[PDB]
């Protein structure tokens, strides 16, 4: 039998009740340049089963407790055993307290410790954040516990089901502000040993998980609103940022989103206030800490003057996401990280609902399809994918836990929950969801608990009927990886399902308890009229007249792509669909217009339709005003561009794309009053951004003209940028393309003086669009200079250049030549050799190019490849695929484009 301090999961012998935790960061270094924080904690816990050892999480903390590493006391009149010895076991991250006797079932104990650790800038635990205000470097203190870093700030039972109440005290310079999950008890008070310091006590938290704790000490200020129930809402940011009003949009949306979720969930927001704080260079993105949610600045702040509409959308959706957790994930918490998908899938879905409430004219719910469904299907249509569910006994180590945080868990999770909601109807879903939340408030659950509660709601009504239990249907979507392609022969109304894989020649080696069969809910539209809902059972083949058609008829499946599957037809129904789109497109719902494109290209990739059938599905676009179907096309074709932009196929492609996009370009020229006012709603704003982008980048002269006109106008008046943030990336890029060192230098200047991150990113990317070799080689020379380009931007700037077809060879040489900079960039800052390699080898589609790549790998002789070690293997295997795809496709593709370019 093995020793419990060597097992990654905690015993169940001791459960915490409550914690006192006092943290004191020292924001001035110790002259050796070390910053530290000091702590003291007391954890009260209960004995469940007899035991003569206390195992508790601890990570990179030194103890300065008097005596042993902890002091142990009994609560009330409980006696307590003497401590034998206390040790730290680093591998499993434990403080282990061996006792001279056993604790007693039903007895409560208090364990006190004093400790300190590094206040590193590592974005982990209690950690520091350095940033610039004027001539001053500022340092603040803040936390990121997710997922196994609470133990890095204070010793605790750091598993998510092991909830307790937390009383937090912060000791801090007296002119700084102290924040935590809960409001402060009253006014800060001076620290008696040194009144330069203050003491802020916070109210007791609700029963909660250690990973949701947060405490922050900074100079930050806030904008406030008291919602009507009394809930204080603040937005915290850098003083300068607050003073520019960049916190306003977040303040505008937060109250609304909160009220929405409180109703949607049928459950009060469980806290007295909600803080949201914008942190500079928070690489985690955002973190749903209960009552104190942290965001990277670009994610929470918004400047109306410079930010685009897609920035606004990012702000509102990110808030909606984190706010969604305040109930789902925080109030009711998954018992273990194997069910992460539930929590994050759920928030990934309801973010759309929350944001839609705040911005009801935008139609945000639509964006889940391009943004999550098709995104995740690209990786879920692979042999190397994995189930939503993972057995709990296979997730044990911090790194195994971190692996749970991926595209499957977020995006498929959102996609399957969205499907669940649609086949139940939202009202029914909400009923079960309210029931789950009430039954499990302040406790922990598994996905089976949600199913059980949704089943309860189903069982209590008569309108919605199901082929099977919620569980049994959901098990097909959660226990096995992948999804089905649904093929229909409209001639007969026969309908099949198979495990879909983009590579038709791939060996699936992961077995399923269901033989890759799903219970599939299928909506469907015939002649623009909604048909009866159908359910495909767990069978390969079936028939229903719902999918039988006539000569003049067409049938389309999966309305609004609510189902997690792709649809293929017979050629005739396909052609008929096409005719409808040529003649009256408004009869096919705008999401399915997109679906036709999305699925067809994937099916072509899988060899289930010819590539010409997919291309035919773009033909209708010349009359399409709407964002999504265009976006589907632009997404599906970016790879054709990447393969053919250096070949005889390109000219035809561009000619074609010009043809398709011009009418749309014209339409906006009209509708925007010669580009003087943006369209009204989000979707139309996106469509315009896409058309202009496409028009210019395929060389539509009217687009080129505009781009040159506006940039001329800007250079004549630098302080008054005429270009609307929405169009900056296109206009900037095209203009620099049409220009020389005049345009490039101006832009570069603008970059060096640009205050706001997004504007800098747009100039940095545009600068890569010069068509001059000397200008792109000069600019590469700049990427390895920190005074000119931030290290954290270098590999990205290199990829932008390689994106330019003129820049492809220049970038590829730069990289091979400077590969002697793995041993300069591996110690100071990661650098991400993985991203750089993948981006620069992206185009490689020929035998010759492959020999070059092999020949480059022959520098194997040390220097290695670092964090891109075997991201070079992926690049070799990706070129082989490209060569093989280009041989099979070149001819057919070329002919089609010529055929259709007028
Ligand atoms: C976790 O933190 C709690 C808050 O600090 C502790 O509870 C506090 O204990 C204090 C003393 O230990 C009490 O303050 C005063 O102390 C003087 C001693 O000189 C006493 O006479 C008074 O009873 C008391 N003052 C008043 C106005 O009653 C606090 O009463 C008390 N604060 C509370 C309960 O909110 C917990 O003890 C601490 N937990 C553990 C396990 O140590
Ligand atoms: C928690 O305890 C750790 C172990 O006590 C501390 O880590 C130790 O830090 C020492 C200095 O910071 C290192 O020793 C040497 O220190 C002298 C004088 O400061 C230097 O000249 C030497 O360069 C240095 N030795 C070397 C080989 O570089 C210890 O090596 C080091 N031990 C480790 C890292 O295991 C932590 O400082 C302490 N942390 C906190 C936050 O209190
Ligand atoms: C947070 O919510 C506020 C309340 O809805 C928004 O305030 C509105 O901002 C609009 C756009 O900035 C203003 O519209 C126009 O602004 C121009 C430019 O100054 C004026 O000339 C026009 O008179 C005005 N009205 C028009 C075109 O009809 C609104 O006036 C203003 N509304 C209120 C009640 O103040 C905030 O914009 C919003 N903040 C953010 C960052 O989105
Ligand atoms: C954290 O603070 C809370 C709030 O005061 C403490 O809650 C009290 O716990 C004591 C000791 O069990 C009880 O006598 C009181 O009934 C509780 N008060 C309230 C208002 O709930 C809690 O004990 C503190 N935690 C720790 C570790 O001391
Ligand atoms: C809070 O107090 C500290 C200590 O005085 C201030 O820190 C100094 O700020 C000045 C700028 O006015 C700098 O020139 C110094 O280098 C800082 N000193 C140290 C030791 O860090 C700080 O500015 C004050 N902050 C607020 C918000 O009032
Ligand atoms: C949760 O939902 C219930 C049921 O919808 C809410 O109670 C209803 O509120 C309306 C208010 O006009 C009444 O007319 C209904 O008859 C109520 N139903 C019941 C069963 O009481 C309830 O208020 C919601 N709670 C929260 C916290 O949002
Ligand atoms: C994790 O969650 C379960 C519930 O899913 C908790 O078990 C419940 O505990 C409460 C209060 O102690 C009781 O009312 C119920 O009888 C329990 N339900 C069960 C066992 O199904 C459990 O305590 C939580 N685990 C931890 C470690 O807090
Ligand atoms: C549609 O499905 C039906 C049956 O589910 C298929 O028809 C059968 O095909 C077998 C194969 O040899 C024949 O022996 C049977 O006599 C047929 N059954 C009938 C007509 O009831 C039919 O081929 C399918 N259509 C397709 C795939 O297009
Ligand atoms: C498919 O999705 C569209 C959105 O693209 C749905 O249309 C929306 O429906 C709601 C309620 O009817 C309205 O409040 C929105 O304003 C509608 N928008 C548009 C553009 O019509 C449509 O109802 C969905 N159809 C089905 C069958 O689910
Ligand atoms: C809208 C979301 C996808 C935003 C997202 N944030 C989250 O998922 C949070 O709710 C996560 N729970 C926090 C997190 C993120 C990354 C790594 C570790 C921990 C992120 O930007 O990473
Ligand atoms: C997979 O197995 C098949 C035969 O079942 C074989 O022809 C093929 O080479 C294998 N691998 C790949 C990657 O196609
Ligand atoms: C085409 O279909 C739309 C959408 O239903 C309908 O409103 C319109 O009357 C039709 N227009 C034409 C020109 O046939
Ligand atoms: Zn999340």
- State the DSSP string of 607-645: TSS-HHHHHHTTGGGGG---HHHHHHHHHHHHHHHHHHT
Q: Which ranges of 716-818 does DSSP label H, i.e. alpha helix?
A: 728-738, 741-753, 757-766, 773-783, 791-803, 807-818
Phi-psi sector, 48: left (phi>0), alpha (psi -120 to 50), beta: alpha
The answer to whether 216 touches 141, Cβ cutoff 8 Å, is: yes
- Which ligand does the CA of 884 lie closest to? 11
Distance separating alpha carbons of residues 318 and 347, to the nearest angstrom: 10
Name the DSSP class of 372.
I
Contacts of 666 (CB under 8 A, 6+ apart): none
Method of determination used here: X-ray
> Which tokens in the block code for residue 652?
């035809």
The answer to whether 696 touches 734, Cβ cutoff 8 Å, is: yes
Q: Which residues pair with 529 in a beta bridge?
A: 526
Distance separating alpha carbons of residues 505 and 523, to the nearest angstrom: 30
Distance separating alpha carbons of residues 617 and 199, to the nearest angstrom: 66
Contacts of 771 (CB under 8 A, 6+ apart): 737, 804, 806
CA-to-CA dists, residue 65 to 114, 298, 330, angstroms: 5, 42, 32
Nearest to 359 by CA among 682, 686, 687, 685: 682
Residue with tokens 């970016």: 638
Q: Which residues pair with 112 in a beta bridge?
A: 42, 71
Q: Which long-range contacts (CB under 8 A, 24 or more apart) does 237-245 make?
A: 237/277, 237/278, 237/297, 237/300, 237/301, 238/131, 238/133, 238/278, 238/280, 238/297, 239/133, 240/133, 241/278, 241/297, 241/301, 244/303
Q: Which residues pair with 556 in a beta bridge?
A: 525
93 a known binding residue? no
472 a known binding residue? no
User: Quick check: CB of 287 below 6 Å from ligand 10?
Assistant: yes
User: Quick check: CB of 713 below 6 Å from ligand 12?
Assistant: no
Q: How much distance in Å is there from the Cα of 116 to the middle of ligand 3?
A: 49
The answer to whether 147 touches 401, Cβ cutoff 8 Å, is: yes
> Which tokens in the block code for residue 4?
């419990």
Q: How much distance in Å is there from the Cα of 20 to the middle of ligand 4?
A: 10
> Which tokens in the block code for residue 1?
């039998």
Helix (H) or strand (E) holding 171: strand 165-173
Name the DSSP class of 269.
-
CA-to-CA dists, residue 379 to 376, 386, 665, angstroms: 5, 10, 34
Question: SS3 string of 668-689?
Answer: HHHHCCCCCCCCCCHHHHHHHH
Crossing angle of the two packed helices 847-857 and 871-900, in degrees rounded to 10: 160
- According to DSSP, the β-strands at 221-226 and 232-237 are antiparallel
> Which tokens in the block code for residue 128?
């520091």
Name the DSSP class of 31.
S
Helix (H) or strand (E) holding 101: strand 94-103
Q: What is the dihedral of CA 621, 625, 626, 628, to 10 degrees?
A: 30
The answer to whether 794 touches 784, Cβ cutoff 8 Å, is: yes
CB count in 10 Å sphere of residue 112: 15
Topology annotation, domain 1-220 = Immunoglobulin-like (2.60.40)
Pick the CATH number of 570-902 from 1.25.50.20, 3.90.1150.10, 2.40.30.110, 3.40.50.10860: 1.25.50.20
Distance between first and last Cα of the chain: 77
Distance separating alpha carbons of residues 765 and 803, to the nearest angstrom: 10
Radius of gyration of the chain (CA): 29
Cis ω before 147 (30° cut-off from 0): yes
285 a known binding residue? yes
Crossing angle of the two packed helices 426-440 and 413-424, in degrees rounded to 10: 110
Helix (H) or strand (E) holding 704: helix 701-715
> Which tokens in the block code for residue 395?
């997730």
Nearest to 197 by CA among 411, 22, 408, 445: 22
The answer to whether 450 touches 436, Cβ cutoff 8 Å, is: yes
The answer to whether 676 touches 724, Cβ cutoff 8 Å, is: no
What was the resolution (in A) of this experimentally determined structure? 2.6
> Which tokens in the block code for residue 64?
């300065």
CA-to-CA dists, residue 290 to 213, 280, 330, 463, angstroms: 7, 20, 7, 38
Distance separating alpha carbons of residues 331 and 442, to the nearest angstrom: 5
CB count in 10 Å sphere of residue 631: 21
Ligand 3 atom closest to residue 245's alpha carbon, by position in its atom list: 41
Distance separating alpha carbons of residues 318 and 303, to the nearest angstrom: 16
Distance separating alpha carbons of residues 888 and 503, to the nearest angstrom: 14
Nearest to 211 by CA among 478, 404, 433: 404
Crossing angle of the two packed helices 741-753 and 728-738, in degrees rounded to 10: 140
Name the DSSP class of 289.
-
Nearest to 616 by CA among 631, 641, 633: 633
Which residue, judged by its Cα, is nearest atom 12 of ligand 7? 443
Distance separating alpha carbons of residues 798 and 632, to the nearest angstrom: 27
Phi-psi sector, 831: left (phi>0), alpha (psi -120 to 50), beta: left
Contacts of 681 (CB under 8 A, 6+ apart): 361, 362, 363
Distance separating alpha carbons of residues 863 and 192, to the nearest angstrom: 55
> Which tokens in the block code for residue 404?
């749970």
Nearest to 171 by CA among 366, 40, 335: 40
877 a known binding residue? no
The answer to whether 892 touches 643, Cβ cutoff 8 Å, is: no
- Which ligand does the CA of 494 lie closest to? 8
CA-to-CA dists, residue 240 to 115, 246, 302, angstroms: 35, 9, 13
Residue with tokens 């380009």: 789
CA-to-CA dists, residue 73 to 42, 80, 111, 169, angstroms: 10, 6, 6, 21
Find how far residue 501's CA is from the centre of its chain: 24
Give 353-366 as a DSSP string.
HHHHHHSTTS-GGG
Which residue, judged by its Cα, is nearest atom 42 of ligand 1? 42
Contacts of 44 (CB under 8 A, 6+ apart): 16, 17, 18, 19, 75, 108, 109, 110
User: Quick check: CB of 375 below 6 Å from ligand 10?
Assistant: no
User: Quick check: CB of 65 below 6 Å from ligand 7?
Assistant: no
Distance separating alpha carbons of residues 505 and 634, to the nearest angstrom: 27
Name the DSSP class of 503.
S
Classify 562 as helix, strand or coil: coil
CA-to-CA dists, residue 445 to 161, 287, 633, angstroms: 8, 21, 41
Where are the domains positioned within the chain? 1-220, 221-482, 483-569, 570-902
Ligand 3 atom closest to residue 304's alpha carbon, by position in its atom list: 41
Strand (E) positions, 202-318?
215-218, 221-226, 232-237, 273-279, 286-287, 292-296
Distance separating alpha carbons of residues 638 and 645, to the nearest angstrom: 10
Q: How much distance in Å is there from the Cα of 353 to the middle of ligand 9?
A: 14
Ligand 6 atom closest to residue 268's alpha carbon, by position in its atom list: 27
Ramachandran angles phi, psi of 651, nearest 5°: -50, -50
Ligand 5, pocket residues at CB < 6 Å: 28, 136, 175, 219
Q: Which of 39, 59, 62, 63 most suits a substitution to test ligand 2, by most atoms within 8 Å of the C-beta? A: 62
Nearest to 767 by CA among 711, 823, 835: 711
> Which tokens in the block code for residue 621?
């676009």
Q: How much distance in Å is there from the Cα of 584 to the middle of ligand 12?
A: 6
CB hemisphere CA count around 120 (13 angstroms): 12
> Which tokens in the block code for residue 830?
């990661």
Longest dimension (CA), the chain: 92
106 a known binding residue? no
Ligand 1 atom closest to residue 110's alpha carbon, by position in its atom list: 41
Distance separating alpha carbons of residues 225 and 234, to the nearest angstrom: 6
Which residue, judged by its Cα, is nearest atom 11 of ligand 10? 287
> Which tokens in the block code for residue 900?
């259709």
As a residue count, the chain comes to: 902
User: Quick check: CB of 117 below 6 Å from ligand 2?
Assistant: yes
Distance separating alpha carbons of residues 122 and 50, to the nearest angstrom: 39
For the domain 483-569, what is the CATH code? 2.60.40.1910
> Which tokens in the block code for residue 190?
């001076």
Contacts of 798 (CB under 8 A, 6+ apart): 780, 783, 811, 814, 815, 836, 839, 840
Classify 847 as helix, strand or coil: helix
Handedness of CA 128, 134, 135, 136 (dihedral sign): negative
Distance separating alpha carbons of residues 156 and 115, to the nearest angstrom: 13
Domains 221-482 and 570-902 share a fold: no
CB count in 10 Å sphere of residue 226: 12
Catalytic residue among 322, 431, 662, 759, which?
Answer: 322
Question: SS3 string of 108-163?
Answer: EEEEEEEEEEECCCCCCEEEEEEEEECCEEEEEEEEECCCCCHHHCCCECCCCCCC
CA-to-CA dists, residue 129 to 120, 168, 458, 898, angstroms: 8, 21, 49, 56
CB count in 10 Å sphere of residue 465: 9
Distance separating alpha carbons of residues 554 and 574, to the nearest angstrom: 8
Ligand 1 atom closest to residue 44's alpha carbon, by position in its atom list: 41
Contacts of 645 (CB under 8 A, 6+ apart): 805, 843
Distance separating alpha carbons of residues 122 and 141, to the nearest angstrom: 12
626 a known binding residue? no
Name the DSSP class of 204.
P
Name the DSSP class of 480.
S
344 a known binding residue? yes
CATH class, 221-482 region: mainly alpha
Name the DSSP class of 516.
T
Ligand 6 atom closest to residue 262's alpha carbon, by position in its atom list: 28
Which residue, judged by its Cα, is nearest atom 4 of ligand 9? 366
Q: Which of 41, 167, 184 most suits a substitution to test ligand 1, by most atoms within 8 Å of the C-beta? A: 167
322 is catalytic: yes
* Residue 175: exposure state from Cβ atoms within 10 A (0-12, 13-18, ≥19): exposed
Classify 383 as helix, strand or coil: coil
Q: Which of 167, 182, 184 most suits a substitution to test ligand 4, by most atoms within 8 Å of the C-beta? A: 167
User: Quick check: CB of 466 below 6 Å from ligand 2?
Assistant: no
User: Quick check: CB of 584 below 6 Å from ligand 12?
Assistant: yes
Distance separating alpha carbons of residues 189 and 199, to the nearest angstrom: 5
Nearest to 421 by CA among 472, 367, 487, 353: 353
């Amino acid at each position: 039998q093995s020793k419990p301090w060597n097992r990654y999961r905690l015993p169940t012998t001791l459960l915490p009740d409550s914690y006192n935790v006092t943290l004191r960061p020292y924001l001035t270094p110790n002259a050796d340049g070390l910053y530290i924080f000091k702590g003291k904690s007391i954890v009260r816990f209960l004995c469940q089963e007899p035991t003569d050892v206390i195992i508790i999480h601890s990570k990179k903390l030194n103890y300065t407790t008097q005596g042993h590493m902890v002091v142990l006391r009994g609560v009330g009149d409980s006696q307590v055993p003497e401590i034998d010895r206390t040790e730290l076991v680093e591998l499993t991250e434990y403080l282990v307290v061996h006792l001279k006797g056993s604790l007693q079932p039903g007895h409560m104990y208090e364990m006190e410790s004093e400790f300190q650790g590094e206040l590193a800038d590592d974005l982990a635990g209690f950690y520091r954040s350095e940033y610039m205000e004027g001539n001053v470097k500022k340092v603040l203190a803040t936390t990121q516990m997710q997922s196994t870093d609470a133990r890095k700030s204070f010793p605790c039972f750091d598993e998510p089901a092991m909830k307790a109440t937390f009383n937090i005290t912060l000791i801090h310079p007296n002119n700084l502000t102290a924040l935590s999950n809960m409001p402060p008890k009253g006014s800060s008070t001076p620290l008696a040993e040194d009144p330069n310091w203050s003491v802020t006590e916070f109210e007791t938290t609700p029963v909660m998980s250690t990973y949701l704790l947060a405490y922050i000490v900074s100079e930050f200020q806030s904008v406030n609103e008291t919602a009507q129930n009394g809930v204080l809402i603040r937005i915290w940011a850098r003083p300068n940022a607050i003073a520019e009003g960049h916190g306003m949009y977040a303040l505008n949306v937060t109250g609304p989103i909160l009220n929405f979720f409180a109703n949607h969930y049928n459950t009060s927001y469980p806290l007295p206030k909600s803080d949201q704080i914008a942190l500079p260079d928070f690489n985690a993105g955002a973190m749903e800490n209960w009552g104190l949610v942290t965001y990277r600045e670009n994610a929470l702040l918004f400047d109306p003057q410079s930010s685009s509409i897609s920035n606004k959308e990012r702000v509102v959706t990110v808030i909606a996401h984190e706010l969604a957790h305040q109930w789902f994930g925080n109030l009711v918490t998954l018992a273990w990280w194997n069910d992460l998908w539930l929590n994050e899938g759920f928030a990934s879905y309801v973010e759309y609902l929350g944001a839609d409430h705040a911005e009801p004219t935008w139609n945000l719910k639509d964006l889940i399809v391009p943004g999550d469904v098709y995104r995740v299907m690209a990786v879920d249509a692979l042999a190397s994918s994995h189930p939503l569910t993972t057995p709990a006994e296979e997730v044990n180590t911090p790194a195994q836990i971190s692996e749970m945080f991926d595209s499957i868990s977020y995006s498929k999770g959102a996609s399957v929950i969205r499907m669940l909601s649609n086949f139940l109807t939202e009202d029914l879903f909400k009923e079960g969801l309210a029931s789950y939340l009430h039954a499990f408030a302040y406790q922990n659950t598994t996905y089976l608990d949600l199913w059980e509660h949704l089943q309860k709601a189903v069982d209590a009504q008569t309108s919605i009927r199901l082929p099977d239990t919620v569980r049994a249907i959901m098990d097909r979507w959660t226990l096995q990886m992948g999804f089905p392609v649904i093929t229909v022969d409209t001639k007969t109304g026969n309908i099949s399902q198979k495990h879909f894989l983009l590579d038709s020649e791939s060996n699936v080696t992961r077995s399923s308890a269901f033989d890759y069969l799903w219970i599939v809910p299928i909506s469907s539209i015939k002649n623009g009229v909604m048909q009866d809902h159908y359910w495909l059972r767990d069978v390969s083949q079936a028939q229903n007249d719902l999918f039988k058609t006539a000569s003049d008829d067409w049938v389309l499946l999966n309305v609004n792509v609510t189902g997690y599957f792709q649809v293929n037809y017979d050629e005739d129904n396909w052609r008929m669909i096409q005719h409808q789109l040529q003649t009256n497109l408004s009869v096919i719902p705008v999401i399915n217009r997109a679906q036709v494109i999305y699925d067809s290209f994937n099916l072509a990739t899988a060899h289930m339709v010819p590539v010409t059938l997919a291309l035919d599905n773009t033909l209708f676009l010349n009359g399409e005003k709407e964002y999504m179907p265009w976006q589907a096309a632009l997404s599906s074709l970016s790879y054709f561009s990447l393969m053919f932009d250096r070949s005889e196929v390109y000219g035809p492609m561009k000619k074609y794309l010009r043809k398709q996009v011009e009418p749309l370009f014209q339409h906006f020229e009209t509708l925007t009053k010669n580009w003087t006012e943006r369209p009204e709603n989000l979707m139309d704003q996106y469509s315009e951004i896409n058309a202009i982008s496409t028009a210019c980048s395929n060389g539509l002269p009217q687009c080129e003209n505009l781009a040159k006109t506006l940039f001329d106008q800007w250079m004549s008046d630098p302080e008054n940028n005429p270009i609307h943030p929405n169009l900056r990336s296109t206009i900037y890029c095209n203009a620099i393309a049409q220009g020389g060192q005049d345009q490039w230098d101006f832009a570069w200047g603008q970059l060096q003086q640009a205050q706001l991150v997004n504007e800098a990113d747009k100039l940095r990317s545009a600068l890569a669009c010069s068509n001059e070799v000397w200008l792109l080689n000069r600019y590469l020379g700049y990427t390895l200079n920190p005074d000119l380009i931030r290290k954290q931007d270098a590999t990205s700037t290199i990829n932008s250049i390689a994106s330019n077809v003129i820049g492809q060879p220049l970038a590829w040489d730069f990289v091979q030549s400077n590969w002697k900079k793995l041993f300069q960039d591996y110690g100071g800052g990661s650098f991400s050799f993985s991203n750089l390699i993948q981006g620069v080898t992206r185009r490689f589609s020929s035998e010759f190019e492959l020999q070059q790549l092999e020949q480059f790998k022959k520098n194997n002789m040390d220097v290695g490849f670092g964090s891109g070690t075997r991201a070079l293997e992926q690049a070799l295997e990706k070129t082989k695929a490209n060569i093989k795809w280009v041989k099979e496709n070149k001819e057919v593709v070329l002919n089609w484009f010529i055929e259709h370019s007028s």
